[PDB]
Design a protein around this ligand. Structure first.
Ligand SMILES: CCCCCCCC(=O)OC[C@H](COP(=O)(O)O[C@@H]1[C@H](O)[C@H](OP(=O)(O)O)[C@H](O)[C@H](OP(=O)(O)O)[C@H]1O)OC(=O)CCCCCCC
Ligand SMILES: CC(C)CCC[C@@H](C)[C@H]1CC[C@H]2[C@@H]3CC=C4C[C@@H](OC(=O)CCC(=O)O)CC[C@]4(C)[C@H]3CC[C@]12C
Ligand SMILES: CC(C)CCC[C@@H](C)[C@H]1CC[C@H]2[C@@H]3CC=C4C[C@@H](OC(=O)CCC(=O)O)CC[C@]4(C)[C@H]3CC[C@]12C
Ligand SMILES: CC(C)CCC[C@@H](C)[C@H]1CC[C@H]2[C@@H]3CC=C4C[C@@H](OC(=O)CCC(=O)O)CC[C@]4(C)[C@H]3CC[C@]12C
Ligand SMILES: CCCCCCCCCCCCO[C@@H]1O[C@H](CO)[C@@H](O[C@H]2O[C@H](CO)[C@@H](O)[C@H](O)[C@H]2O)[C@H](O)[C@H]1O
Ligand SMILES: CC(C)CCC[C@@H](C)[C@H]1CC[C@H]2[C@@H]3CC=C4C[C@@H](O)CC[C@]4(C)[C@H]3CC[C@]12C
Ligand SMILES: CC(C)CCC[C@@H](C)[C@H]1CC[C@H]2[C@@H]3CC=C4C[C@@H](O)CC[C@]4(C)[C@H]3CC[C@]12C
Ligand SMILES: CC(C)CCC[C@@H](C)[C@H]1CC[C@H]2[C@@H]3CC=C4C[C@@H](O)CC[C@]4(C)[C@H]3CC[C@]12C
Ligand SMILES: CC(C)CCC[C@@H](C)[C@H]1CC[C@H]2[C@@H]3CC=C4C[C@@H](O)CC[C@]4(C)[C@H]3CC[C@]12C
Ligand SMILES: *[C@@H]1O[C@H](CO)[C@@H](O)[C@H](O)[C@H]1NC(C)=O
Ligand SMILES: CCCCCCCCCCCCCC
Ligand SMILES: [NH3+]CCC[NH2+]CCCC[NH2+]CCC[NH3+]
Ligand SMILES: CCCCCCCCCCCC
Ligand SMILES: CCCCCCCCCC
Ligand SMILES: CCCCCCCCCC
Ligand SMILES: CCCCCCCCCC
Ligand SMILES: CCCCCCCCCC
Ligand SMILES: CCCCCCCCCC
Ligand SMILES: CCCCCCCCCC
Ligand SMILES: CCCCCCCCCC
Ligand SMILES: CCCCCCCCCC
Ligand SMILES: [Mg+2]
Length: 1000
């Protein structure tokens, strides 16, 4: 965490960078400091460009503005201002640290216009600006991949070797891929800018009166908003200073229940908003209403703005965050060896210098396929089309590969695992001092007062809507209710008072006037006559509240006079029901050892009840609640574990999560290893948990749906959103259907791509390597394949097999075994090496057999490589290799358990049959395609049969080798050095806890 400030020289840096033509890689390589050191022209006090190390390197421009001089710079969305008192840069969010609550109250009156302008210059606009970049900026940024440079180099070489057509094909593929990539990245950025964009007309008072109306962009910390009496979105973070409000903080917690926010308690002591969260209004949370009760209107002082807000922090984290397929040493050394051999043999076979350089250069492109990434991505396009045919839409197809190697899934509770709302579980009538049994549906009850109160008392508020829907009494004196008995009309009513949570309604029917009161259990019970209220109201209430349910008391009297004397008629209990398809999906994931986690902003009781109900915690598995008391400053923090009714499971809280992260880093891995429920998580805490789990060498996905869990979706390896707005922007995947079933299906698809990818990769490597050998063989005798032969190997054979081996789909079920997670694994390397030993054996045997014939005459090596054709050695080697490409393409691909069996994709097998038919025709049928392809038309039938026998030997050898390797290599590996002790951090932690569970 250090920095420095740098101040004609740009022209020299530009010339040196442009002249080198590769120094950008060196600057982009491990040593980038020199590139900045020369260009920046090296103090902090006096600078025009700043560099910071994060102990990592980052470069920023020292922006400036006039007020009468200001110097500021942005970094990770956070602004910093230069201060002359200490001659250093300071984060603006800490400019006023530990402000007293009385100091906040002193700004009850607004902010002077001069103070508004100067303070706006300090903090900046209230908007959250997404720096959308122009097409060249994205190009230099997200399309600097060195493989594209290698592709361009190969293209230029091929145009320098008259190999126009394949160069054109690669150019079209690469250009189209680059253009689509740039377009979609810009589209995502534009959509993000739109999502985070906010615009409102907000009233702000002034010490000179006449409360003005301004844009949201003008707010600065220190003026106060006049919150509207009706409601609307909150432009920024603020602290209530006068009045009370009801807010909808579904953007932070994920629940839509109204939340009461009261005025800030005046006094000394700093205002943090971590302990004054009940008196502060956060950005984005929807205000249901604001009632003052004192003075002419509700007042809330601004505290944070722009990126400083909680939403600002979340968006900042969102903005600012196979792999082994790019192994370098082996391919580089092998290409180098082949090159030096080529120059040696070529100078041994006298040919011109320009030809020698071109030939030596082309072997590297033969070794490394420039078409490899396109072959890799075909299967991801197949998987994307498959998913889009069934709801799920993806933006980055290569991310689908991560679904194959996913091993941990986090789930939001509200909306994702459970319905996005509450539903009636039943009404609980009580006659004397004993509740009658809970009724499943309230329809089946007498025509007594209780049903009438269930049908009439309401503000007609999803809660009352659900009440009236279940009882079924249709609406039509403020109303007249029809049962599906008597028509009951509402004679009088009262508003639902926000302070005292009571709601009374007086009704009468053709058959005395009677009042019904709906309210909270304890308060209404206190209002009622203890004669009717039962003794065990406290235990029946802890029984429901502790189980995550929400109870409502109904009282009545046959008619201050109305809300006085009351008697309880019953209790209505509500629950956030599990969606009908979560338990099968959760158990399906669990039986394959895919860990399911709950990560909720809800309370802990509802979270644990839902976790037990849906099957994340089996009835036989233990479960422990870990609680961490805050450091009192007299004694340090200490963890305390409370078991419950009963693989171990841990239920961590929100503040306790932060406490464990801060004061117990050493014990955090153990908790994360066996934690299943995470309640009261802040939007940033979800991302923190995801990042920590990823640090434990996991591949974590999450299936959130709401706005609160967006940073976690961005941070997760495989994020899925169950909502077409507020979360599809960041998620790589989005499902039209809203339930957990998208998670398993995605995994299955991912496994195919992670399996298909391996096979495709294997073929391409082989494709390349065998070709390299063949080229070398001909180069040993001053000969080359030929332009048409090269084209018939690169265009038709590779494209057909590569695209057609990716059609296969999953096996409709999830097995217990994951696919291999690494292309550099022992099985992959062994398979390629053994397959090449076989292929080289067959090719060399064919070459050494064709020399021992009565009818063979060697080529004359005095002529160039392409002018030696048609030629006996070339046609023999080409005939063998052409079949070998198909043999390997067929043998490499696999079926079960991650894909359908290899005989299902009839197009691929039919393509192989036609390609093999034309190839055997080329070998046997004389002079039909041997004009274009310079072949010498072997006349001896017996030798042709021997060639056919050799390629059949290659066929049977490759298939038997793949079968025996797959069915007997794990046994040999395990039987040797059985002490595996896998290096992944989470597996190691499981072993330490398994031998000795640390929490006794
Ligand atoms: C020239 C270098 C070759 C490659 C070296 C790579 C290291 C190597 O072999 O892995 C250890 C293997 C087995 O390991 P291997 O199959 O190669 O893969 C490893 C483990 O299997 C591990 O899984 P588990 O521990 O089973 O959970 C996990 O899959 C990791 O790969 P991932 O990234 O795909 O997740 C690797 O750490 O152990 C033997 O089975 C005896 C072989 C002895 C032969 C010695 C080879 C020199
Ligand atoms: C594999 C090898 C051959 C790499 C080839 C890369 C090309 C695909 C790149 C090189 C130059 C790029 C172009 C550079 C500049 C522009 C200008 C741009 O138009 C503008 O000038 C306005 C842009 C703006 O105002 O945002 C449209 C995209 C385009 C044609 C780019 C599209 C992609 C191109 C053709
Ligand atoms: C000339 C050279 C550069 C070769 C180019 C090959 C293309 C013609 C290939 C590459 C990607 C292929 C596509 C990859 C994936 C699909 C998804 C596939 O969808 C499915 O069949 C699964 C969905 C379902 O059936 O449920 C339909 C064909 C299509 C569009 C393929 C059509 C042929 C494409 C365009
Ligand atoms: C100069 C001579 C050698 C002409 C070569 C022409 C090539 C450019 C042609 C020959 C065979 C063609 C291929 C034959 C069959 C297919 C299958 C086709 O399959 C699908 O469309 C998807 C099938 C599915 O999704 O089920 C995609 C195009 C492709 C690879 C064709 C792409 C263009 C190829 C390689
Ligand atoms: C040898 C056989 C050749 C087969 C030829 C036919 C297949 C041609 C497919 C070309 C790839 C087109 O597909 C496009 O490719 C680019 C990179 O490859 C991907 O780009 C990838 O990286 C960029 C960042 O670098 C991400 O923003 C993007 O999400 C990711 O998928 C695009 O998301 C994918 O949509
Ligand atoms: C031995 C002699 C003949 C070989 C010369 C081949 C040279 C020109 C080749 C080999 C590898 C190639 C480089 C591979 C990677 C990159 C990264 C890219 O971001 C800039 C281009 C650059 C730097 C390529 C330019 C051309 C290149 C340097
Ligand atoms: C001059 C000598 C080294 C010969 C040139 C060998 C070339 C072909 C070597 C040198 C460095 C190599 C690159 C190093 C890094 C990567 C990783 C990833 O981005 C794709 C492969 C890629 C891009 C390699 C491909 C092969 C490569 C380009
Ligand atoms: C015969 C010679 C000139 C080759 C020309 C092949 C052309 C038609 C190829 C090159 C790259 C290909 C595209 C690559 C990417 C995609 C995205 C996929 O989601 C739909 C198909 C689509 C849009 C392909 C269609 C066919 C395509 C445009
Ligand atoms: C038709 C003439 C030219 C010969 C070429 C036919 C080849 C490509 C075809 C014929 C039938 C095919 C086989 C049919 C059934 C199976 C079982 C399955 O586990 C995949 C491998 C295997 C063994 C197939 C491999 C490809 C195959 C051998
Ligand atoms: C190889 O080179 C010459 C070029 O004319 C060709 O005619 C002849 O077949 C070969 N030379 C000899 C001496 O055989
Ligand atoms: C299986 C691949 C067969 C390749 C066929 C090549 C056909 C080339 C057309 C003729 C071009 C040259 C004629 C002068
Ligand atoms: N798989 C990429 C290798 C492509 N090699 C093509 C070489 C073409 C040589 N043509 C020589 C033409 C002489 N005028
Ligand atoms: C677009 C793929 C190339 C097909 C056209 C070229 C055919 C080869 C011509 C060779 C002339 C010697
Ligand atoms: C000829 C190159 C353009 C092919 C079409 C590109 C994508 C179309 C998406 C509808
Ligand atoms: C130059 C050909 C451009 C084809 C891609 C344009 C985008 C298509 C809609 C995604
Ligand atoms: C080659 C031009 C066509 C590419 C788009 C094909 C889409 C087919 C959807 C089934
Ligand atoms: C060139 C004619 C063959 C194209 C493929 C036909 C469709 C097969 C997959 C359904
Ligand atoms: C040219 C290779 C593709 C041939 C496909 C034939 C159709 C098979 C589906 C019945
Ligand atoms: C794809 C491998 C094809 C092998 C052909 C063998 C010739 C069979 C006809 C006798
Ligand atoms: C010498 C008579 C030919 C024997 C050739 C053996 C290969 C048989 C391929 C069917
Ligand atoms: C159970 C998998 C059987 C695969 C047999 C492959 C050998 C093919 C002989 C033609
Ligand atoms: Mg939610």
């Amino acid at each position: 965490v250090r920095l420095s400030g740098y101040c004609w020289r740009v022209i020299g840096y530009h010339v040196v960078v442009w002249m080198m033509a590769g120094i950008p890689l060196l600057l982009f390589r491990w040593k980038p400091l020199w590139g900045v050191r020369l260009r920046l022209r090296p103090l902090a006090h006096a600078e025009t460009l700043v560099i910071e190390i994060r102990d990592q390197l980052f470069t920023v421009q020292v922006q400036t503005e006039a007020i009468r001089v200001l110097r500021y710079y942005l970094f990770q969305g956070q602004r910093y201002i230069w201060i002359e008192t200490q001659q250093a840069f300071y984060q603006v969010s800490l400019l006023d640290h530990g402000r007293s609550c009385d100091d906040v109250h002193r700004s009850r009156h607004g902010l002077s216009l001069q103070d508004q302008m100067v303070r706006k210059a300090i903090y900046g606009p209230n908007v959250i600006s997404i720096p959308v970049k122009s097409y060249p900026q994205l190009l230099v940024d997200e399309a600097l991949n060195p493989y594209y440079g290698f592709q361009a180099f190969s293209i230029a070489l091929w145009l320098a070797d008259h190999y126009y057509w394949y160069a054109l094909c690669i150019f079209l593929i690469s250009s189209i891929s680059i253009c689509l990539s740039l377009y979609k990245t810009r589209k995502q950025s534009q959509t993000l800018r739109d999502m985070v964009k906010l615009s409102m007309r907000v009233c702000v008072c002034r010490p000179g009166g006449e409360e003005e109306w301004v844009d949201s962009s003008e707010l600065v910390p220190g003026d106060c908003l006049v919150l509207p009496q009706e409601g609307g979105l909150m432009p920024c973070d603020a602290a209530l200073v006068a009045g009370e409000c009801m807010v909808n903080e579904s953007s932070l917690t994920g629940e839509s229940i109204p939340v009461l926010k009261t005025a800030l308690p005046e006094g000394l002591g700093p205002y943090c908003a971590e302990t004054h969260r009940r008196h502060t209004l956060f950005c984005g949370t929807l205000i249901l209403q604001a009632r003052a009760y004192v003075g002419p209107h509700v007042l809330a002082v601004v505290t944070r703005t722009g990126f400083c807000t909680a939403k600002g922090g979340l968006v900042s984290s969102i903005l600012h965050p196979k792999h082994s397929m790019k192994f370098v040493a082996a391919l580089s050394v092998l290409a180098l060896l082949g090159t030096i051999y080529s120059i040696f043999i070529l100078y041994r076979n006298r040919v011109p210098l320009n030809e020698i350089v071109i030939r030596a250069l082309d072997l590297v492109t033969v070794v490394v396929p420039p078409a490899l990434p396109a072959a890799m991505t075909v299967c991801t396009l197949y998987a994307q089309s498959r998913l889009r045919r069934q709801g799920i839409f993806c933006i980055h197809p290569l991310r689908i590969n991560l679904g194959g190697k996913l091993q941990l899934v986090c789930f939001d509770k509200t909306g994702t695992l459970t319905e996005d709302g509450l539903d009636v579980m039943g009404v609980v009538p009580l006659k004397g001092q004993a509740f009658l049994p809970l009724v499943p549906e309230p329809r089946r009850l007498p025509v007594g007062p209780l049903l009438r109160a269930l049908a009439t008392c309401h503000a007609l508020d999803p809660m009352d809507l659900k009440m009236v829907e279940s009882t079924g009494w249709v609406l039509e004196v403020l109303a007249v209710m029809r049962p599906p008995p008597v028509p009951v009309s509402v004679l009088h009513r009262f508003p639902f008072s926000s302070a005292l949570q009571r709601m009374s309604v007086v009704v009468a029917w053709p058959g005395q006037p009677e009042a019904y009161v709906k309210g909270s259990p304890e308060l209404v019970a206190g209002l009622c006559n203890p004669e009717t209220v039962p003794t065990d109201f406290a235990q029946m209430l802890q029984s429901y509240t502790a189980a995550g349910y929400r109870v409502v008391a109904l009282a009545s009297k046959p008619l201050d006079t109305v809300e006085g004397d009351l008697s309880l008629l019953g209790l209505l209990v509500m629950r956030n029901l599990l969606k009908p398809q979560t338990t099968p999906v959760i158990q399906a994931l669990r039986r394959t050892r895919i860990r399911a986690v709950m990560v909720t902003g809800d309370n802990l009781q509802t979270a644990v009840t839902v976790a037990r109900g849906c099957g994340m915690v089996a009835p036989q598995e233990h479960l422990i609640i870990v609680h961490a008391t805050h450091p009192e400053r007299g004694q340090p923090a200490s963890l305390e574990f409370l078991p419950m009714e009963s693989s171990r499971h841990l239920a961590l809280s929100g503040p306790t999560f932060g406490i464990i992260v801060k004061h117990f880093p050493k014990l955090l891995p153990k908790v994360l290893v066996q934690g299943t429920v995470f309640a009261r998580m802040a939007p940033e805490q979800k991302t923190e948990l995801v990042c920590e789990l990823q640090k434990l060498q996991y591949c974590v996905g999450m299936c959130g749906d709401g706005a609160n869990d967006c940073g976690a979706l961005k941070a997760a390896d495989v994020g899925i959103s169950l909502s077409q707005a507020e979360a599809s922007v960041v998620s790589p995947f989005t499902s039209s259907m809203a339930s957990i079933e998208c998670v398993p299906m995605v995994i299955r698809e991912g496994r195919c791509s992670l399996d298909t990818s391996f096979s495709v990769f294997k073929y391409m490597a082989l494709y390349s390597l065998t070709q390299f050998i063949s080229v070398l063989i001909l180069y040993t005798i001053n000969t080359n394949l030929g332009d048409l032969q090269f084209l018939a190997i690169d265009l038709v054979i590779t494209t057909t097999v590569a695209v057609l081996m990716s059609r296969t789909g999953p096996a409709l079920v999830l097995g217990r075994v994951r696919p291999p997670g690494a292309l550099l694994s022992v099985p992959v390397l062994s398979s390629l090496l053994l397959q090449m030993v076989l292929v080289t054996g067959v090719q060399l045997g064919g070459y050494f057999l064709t020399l021992a014939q009565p009818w063979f005459v060697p080529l004359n090596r005095t002529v160039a490589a392409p002018d030696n054709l048609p030629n006996y050695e070339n046609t023999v080697v080409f005939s063998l290799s052409s079949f070998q490409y198909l043999i390997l393409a067929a043998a490499v691909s696999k079926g079960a358990p991650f894909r359908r069996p290899l005989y299902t994709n009839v197009p691929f097998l039919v393509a192989l049959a036609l390609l093999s038919s034309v190839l055997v025709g080329l070998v046997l049928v004389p002079g039909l395609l041997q004009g274009p392809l310079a072949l010498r038309n072997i006349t001896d039938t017996g030798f042709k049969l021997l060639l056919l026998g050799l390629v059949t030997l290659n066929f049977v050898g490759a298939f038997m080798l793949e079968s025996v390797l797959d069915q007997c290599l794990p046994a040999c590996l395990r039987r040797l050095r059985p002490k595996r002790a896998s290096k992944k951090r989470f597996k190691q932690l499981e072993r330490e806890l398994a031998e000795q569970p640390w929490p006794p």
